[PDB]
Curated annotation (Swiss-Prot), chain B:
Source species, domain of life: Bacteria
Cell compartment(s), UniProt: Cytoplasm
PANTHER family: RNA 3' TERMINAL PHOSPHATE CYCLASE, RNA 3'-TERMINAL PHOSPHATE CYCLASE
UniProt organism field: Escherichia coli (strain K12)
Family designation: Belongs to the RNA 3'-terminal cyclase family. Type 1 subfamily.
General function of this protein: Catalyzes the conversion of 3'-phosphate to a 2',3'-cyclic phosphodiester at the end of RNA. The mechanism of action of the enzyme occurs in 3 steps: (A) adenylation of the enzyme by ATP; (B) transfer of adenylate to an RNA-N3'P to produce RNA-N3'PP5'A; (C) and attack of the adjacent 2'-hydroxyl on the 3'-phosphorus in the diester linkage to produce the cyclic end product. Likely functions in some aspects of cellular RNA processing.
Protein name: RNA 3'-terminal phosphate cyclase
Effect seen on changing residue 284 to A: Loss of RNA cyclase activity and RtcA adenylation
Result when mutating residue 283 to A: Loss of RNA cyclase activity and RtcA adenylation
Catalytic activity: a 3'-end 3'-phospho-ribonucleotide-RNA + ATP = a 3'-end 2',3'-cyclophospho-ribonucleotide-RNA + AMP + diphosphate
Active site positions, chain numbering: 305
Summary of pH dependence: Optimum pH is 8.0-8.5.
Length: 334, 335
């Protein structure tokens, strides 16, 4: 029984989701207190409750404290099972966050699984569901993890409606991933996703990307208007050792040029370091690498989220992380 | 103009307080948006406003957005002035947070200064005002920074009422401070402060510390009932190369033994690693070494607070921190 203080690091939902995952994998139960204690609406909100129930269902846990506003939670996992799971988060609800809770555990399930989640997929506060398939999965495959995500329908905040489905197989063995240098840029590509939003908005965004970067491809993907309004712009940087993809989800009163220019600045900050992975992808490689007992990547700067994922992993798993930050590059390794 | 998002890293008052200090010292103005945006009560609160106000008063600043609830502030410092100031936070408000906002700028003031603040000195959520003289100041003195704090009266949470006074002289020259290893134990000293709490409670507390450590001294300090109720227990670990002091502020209905065991726990934690400084103290040396331009320390683990301080510092000052975390300890060095 691990006792977690939910007020470590940035002190929000990340602590809870990472522990839920690690509890399921390791079978170690846990209690967490001060869940989001300083936030406007403190304790477990409806989205956290959704994540806890999904976890509960895939491993038959026994739970105490799973109620709105609760600041305490006790989770005692059972055996992780395979099979066809369908969850509904709806609302703002990020698909991504349910998936990040349950996917790692399903890697240890007793058989293959399929996880369907309906809810938001594209929201300006966080990387879209599309980041799983396009950036995360190919690095999971090299670690020896079998996970294939399909966006079946986008749900653009504030609208829900999106549909994501991931197929997963139990891992046989973990490989050691070693990322240091990106390597030379092989190609960049820009894509605009549109649903119920005029075409010219994608032509302008694509032209702002094209003003700064040489693009191998300039794609405009139009979705059915029933999924809109929505606009997402992404830029892929395929280097010799890694493929990264950066995303800006467009907001209601923001213009095309401002959405695009935020994307351009994020890409130039990645290119300005020699680090192989961006901040957010760095947070997601922590667990799979912990799980393999070895591996490394470079990230520009350690972040609070990186520290917190590392701390929660180290409570459940006997691995230790080293962090050697020295020349505008931080090497993260087992 | 330096633009800061106040939602980075930890997302709270710390970012604001360090940018105030750094803007004053260097003369660089800044704006900060999304001040405390995720919090229960977001943006500028009373305590934050008291800190912007004291800062505006020591340097004659041009300020926009200094209001309750604002999530945006713009601050354009004038010349830091030496003089004698008095700030009242009252409430529970901690004197340390005002002090930590103006003292560093006063090291670059055009003459000596004296800061007096009134408000809370001893609260369960943070090291007492007493940490400044007992811990930090000897260290600032080796960095070439001359300041001396006095506890004139204690204000124990949830009451204010305490008074702290600091004297500062502008720095003439910075020095490189290098902390590696703690070195060997030299002595350990226990102390309990009481205000309107039976002496038996202090005795119990010293006797629990005495149960885990060899105490070279064991003082008990009774304050007038005036300043209570309150009870602060502390334990100093003087090693050859560094001295630390860890404190607990006893909470309303919490046993003597439970107060003291919390304190034994933080001390054994610090002694479970070979780092020279605990997390809190490492957070305090970032700015002063950045200003000297060179320096290093070891801390067991990097925390969010430490990262936040280093990133605000590197936005204003032409320095870069390196973090080498390897065998249970992190070396933090500035270049
Ligand atoms: O834990 S010691 C007790 C003393 O500090 C008072 O009860 C504070 S309100």
């Amino acid at each position: 029984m691990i006792a977690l203080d939910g007020a470590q690091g940035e002190g929000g939902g990340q602590i809870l989701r990472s522990a839920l995952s690690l509890s399921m994998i390791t079978g170690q139960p846990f209690t967490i207190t001060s869940i989001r204690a300083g936030r406007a609406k403190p304790g477990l909100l409806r989205q956290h409750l959704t994540a806890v129930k999904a976890a509960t269902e895939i491993c038959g846990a026994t739970v105490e404290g799973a109620e709105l506003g609760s600041q305490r939670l006790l989770f005692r996992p059972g055996t992780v099972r395979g099979g066809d799971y369908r969850f509904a988060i709806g609302s703002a609800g990020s698909c991504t966050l349910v998936l990040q809770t349950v996917l790692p555990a399903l890697w240890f399930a007793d058989g293959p699984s399929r996880v369907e989640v309906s809810g938001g997929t594209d929201n300006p506060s966080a990387p879209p569901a599309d980041f799983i398939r396009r950036v995360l999965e190919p690095l999971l495959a090299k670690i020896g993890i079998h996970q294939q995500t399909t966006l079946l329908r986008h749900g653009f905040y504030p609208a829900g409606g999106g549909v994501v489905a991931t197929e997963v197989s139990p891992v046989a063995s973990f490989n050691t991933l070693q990322l240091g240098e990106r390597g030379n840029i092989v190609q960049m590509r820009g894509e605009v996703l549109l649903a119920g939003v005029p075409r010219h908005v994608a032509e302008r965004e694509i032209a702002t990307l094209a003003g700064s970067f040489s693009l191998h491809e300039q794609n405009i993907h139009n979705l059915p208007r029933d999924q809109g309004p929505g606009n997402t712009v992404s830029l892929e940087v395929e280097s010799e050792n890694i493929t990264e993809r950066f995303f800006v989800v467009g907001e209601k009163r923001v213009s095309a040029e401002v959405v695009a220019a935020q994307l351009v600045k994020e890409v130039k900050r990645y290119l300005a370091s020699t680090a192989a992975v961006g901040e957010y992808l760095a947070d997601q490689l922590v667990l799979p690498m912990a799980l393999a007992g070895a591996g490394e990547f470079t990230v520009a700067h350690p972040s609070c989220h990186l520290l917190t994922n590392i701390a929660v992993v180290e409570r459940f798993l006997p691995v230790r992380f080293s962090l050697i930050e020295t020349d505008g590059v931080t090497r993260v390794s087992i």
